Design a protein around this ligand. Structure first.
Ligand SMILES: Oc1c(Br)cccc1Br
Ligand SMILES: Oc1c(Br)cccc1Br
Ligand code: SF4
Ligand code: SF4
Ligand code: SF4
Ligand code: SF4
Lengths: 419, 443
């Protein structure tokens, strides 16, 4: 697999084509959060927050012995087990995605963490860096990234175009039990300050925050191929908790090396753009980053840092030309959210960032299918050529973290392929 | 013949019954007696002769090594930056672990109820933790819970009936009103008792496990071979540390699954009871001279955690692949141990010191001597694990009829940082050994 990645390396430079209209995108505009898309009816006709309507459908399916919309389970017990696995997978994730910056798991400084307090006498986070050489730092941090659970890791200079103009967060002293009802919008700004810092008014990223480290966290193929049913939800959920652990582990390593580090999971900025600029894969018709190793069946998280690093090269292995003629995701999408048309610079709705050349999809149509189906769909990921019943999945092949030993050698790494 | 870990486990499976041999002086063991916590062993001199809590003296040695550009005792690093990087990696690995081991029950990550967790609150409208179980068949439950366990990061998983002999008589914990920054100064003992109650509960005086708590699920969390082979130096400390955080994630993930199936679940990591005994009874491996559970897949180079539950399950069979007989003649760990903590003598039922639980046949090691080497070396040693022939990846051969151990196996850090790695430090050359189908999970 290291052969292929070297073979398809592009020359340096962001491969995302932009025009003079591009502006940073306010996070509240996503379909998950925006007032125009947030409320959806449940199966009884009651309008609720979309995830509560989705909950009602999960309950209905368990009672009716179903693993998904009009997909009968082996019995009620199997139906229950799939939703229990899904719910458990989210254990280390806040309110579906860890998006609030500098809250809960996503702290922008390590100072208050229990691990930092226990290690304080050693003073690793107070000691100036002993290594400033970006080549050695790139090798160290990528090794750490693999220890921390990334199946793929890449480095890019930070393109501020993909950092949200304003984040969705909560006030700092609001308890978890009130968080969903007290979400607010808060600017993310870049200033000449020593350290990432949050004021009452602003999330402040230092101008020295040069780089972004992007991690790919592989989902399980057997489970994703049950999309839109419950086991696809379960591999989604478990990987969100893997994302969170990656961010915390890697931020701590970077801090203990003498630099600062900002975790993010689904917050702070647009993961797909970062992942493309860092060479993990290419943008696709469905909108996901398609990787050679996993196709789009891989989750993304990222960490921002002033640690000196060597940027990776973007890769071109023909995804754009293949998506131009394929359209399989668009034809299988249960909500017709994915376009069959050509790429443009103009978003279809508020949910798209205009000003960048991409396939423009209707993400409110996507979200509408989630309460209907009682899950997170994923049919587009499941049918994509690059990616390649529920009783058979439960009785079938599994391995640690859902990884597959038939392909796990493809992500082996030596220094030569780290820097 | 291509290595078949499932065939190996089938070949060496025993008939039912705890393999640990006990006599009449066996009593449950108070957790405060471990070398980490007992006042006789807790204090150790640093390299300047100052007597401190052992981990503070070890800190002093880590700092000295970085300043002198060393990766371990008398082991020069490539440069100061490499020495720094190894300790940064080690420190980061512990991110999801409280005070080296997560031992306080029902505190921090080790909650005995899911009710207050952010995930439970988010999911409350579905009622999964309040709805009665839809599955009570132990066969289906074993398949379900083991699949979840592999999703949750276990490289090995097994089930045993809970043997209360290995549950600590009293736990080490902190009062519920004590904040983290004072925890190390406010540790206390608290009895673990079994009573006729519906759910695990803590009172001001007792940690109460229900009499319905029939089963224990044991997970093996594989460490990285290349890094452990640097024991007693910093990279062995880093694979130890990262696996403690994997243990914590496993416990929380699995307890939440079990609760959402309609049962209760008690996490534990290094607390609550003795992991090696549970692992032996659950068939992960056999006890050894060094004292660890040796597994066919990883030897002793694997961490353990466990979850206690009333979920009906099918116990696994113990395994006997000849470890006792190899340990009888090997003694490599005993010869290489830098503190001479491991005995070269026979097994007995009589503890060597307060740190051993008497009344069970085992090799009796001096664990105060072991702990004494940790401040001296500035780490968690591991030389015994590193030199054990079972830690080697290629011990198994097939003779055309059956699997056997190759007797011939019993006769630097820069290169690790520049060398092979993969996700979670797992090794794709051997990762096929832990593939699992339904037949591997429940018979
Ligand atoms: O990424 C997600 C977010 Br942010 C919210 C709900 C579900 C998913 Br998947
Ligand atoms: O298992 C451990 C405990 Br409990 C404490 C310190 C170091 C280790 Br390793
Ligand atoms: S997740 Fe489902 S509804 Fe959404 S774009 Fe993909 S196929 Fe369509
Ligand atoms: S299904 Fe086809 S068009 Fe859609 S993302 Fe995959 S390759 Fe592209
Ligand atoms: S080194 Fe030898 S005696 Fe020690 S635990 Fe391993 S096999 Fe047994
Ligand atoms: S960890 Fe080190 S000091 Fe302790 S028993 Fe093993 S070899 Fe000896």
């Amino acid at each position: 697999a290291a052969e292929i990645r070297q073979q398809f390396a592009m020359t340096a430079g962001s491969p995302i084509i932009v025009n003079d209209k591009l502006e940073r995108y306010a996070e509240v505009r996503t379909a998950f959060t925006h007032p125009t898309s947030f409320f959806k009816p449940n199966y009884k006709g009651e309008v609720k927050p979309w995830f509560l309507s989705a909950y009602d459908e999960k309950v209905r399916q368990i009672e009716n012995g179903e693993n998904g919309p009009k997909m009968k389970a082996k019995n009620v017990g199997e139906a229950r087990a799939g939703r229990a696995l899904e719910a458990a997978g989210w254990t280390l994730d806040i309110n579906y995605g860890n998006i609030y910056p500098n809250r809960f798991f996503m702290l922008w400084s390590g100072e208050t963490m229990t691990n930092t307090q226990l290690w304080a006498p050693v003073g690793l986070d107070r000691r100036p860096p002993d290594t400033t050489d970006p080549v050695e730092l790139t090798n160290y941090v990528k090794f750490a990234a693999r220890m921390a659970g990334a199946d793929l890791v890449g480095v890019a200079r930070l393109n501020r175009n993909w950092v949200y103009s304003e984040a969705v967060t909560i006030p700092a002293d609001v308890p978890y039990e009130q968080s969903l009802h007290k979400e607010i919008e808060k600017p993310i700004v870049f200033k000449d300050v020593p350290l990432p810092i949050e004021t009452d008014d602003e999330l402040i990223i230092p101008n020295t925050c040069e780089n972004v480290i992007v991690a790919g966290i592989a989902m399980n193929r057997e489970m994703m191929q049950t999309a839109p049913n419950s086991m696809a939800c379960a591999t989604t959920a478990f990987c969100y908790s893997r994302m969170c652990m990656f961010d915390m582990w890697l931020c701590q390593f970077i801090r203990y090396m003498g630099y600062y580090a900002i975790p993010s999971c689904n917050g702070v900025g647009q993961s797909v753009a970062f992942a493309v600029e860092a060479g993990l894969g290419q943008a696709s018709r469905m909108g996901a980053c398609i990787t050679p190793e996993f196709g789009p069946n891989v989750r993304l998280t990222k960490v921002f840092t002033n640690m000196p690093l060597v940027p990776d090269k973007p890769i071109d292995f023909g995804v754009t030309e293949f998506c131009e003629t394929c359209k399989k995701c668009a034809r299988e999408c249960p909500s017709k959210a994915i376009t069959e048309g050509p790429r443009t610079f103009e978003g279809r709705s508020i949910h798209n960032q205009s000003g960048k050349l991409q396939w423009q999809n209707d993400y409110n149509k996507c979200l509408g299918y989630w309460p209907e189906s009682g899950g997170y769909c994923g049919v587009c990921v499941a049918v994509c050529p690059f990616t390649k019943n529920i009783t058979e999945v439960w009785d079938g092949k599994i391995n640690t973290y859902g990884l597959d030993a038939d392909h796990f050698r493809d992500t082996v790494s030596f220094r030569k392929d780290r820097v």
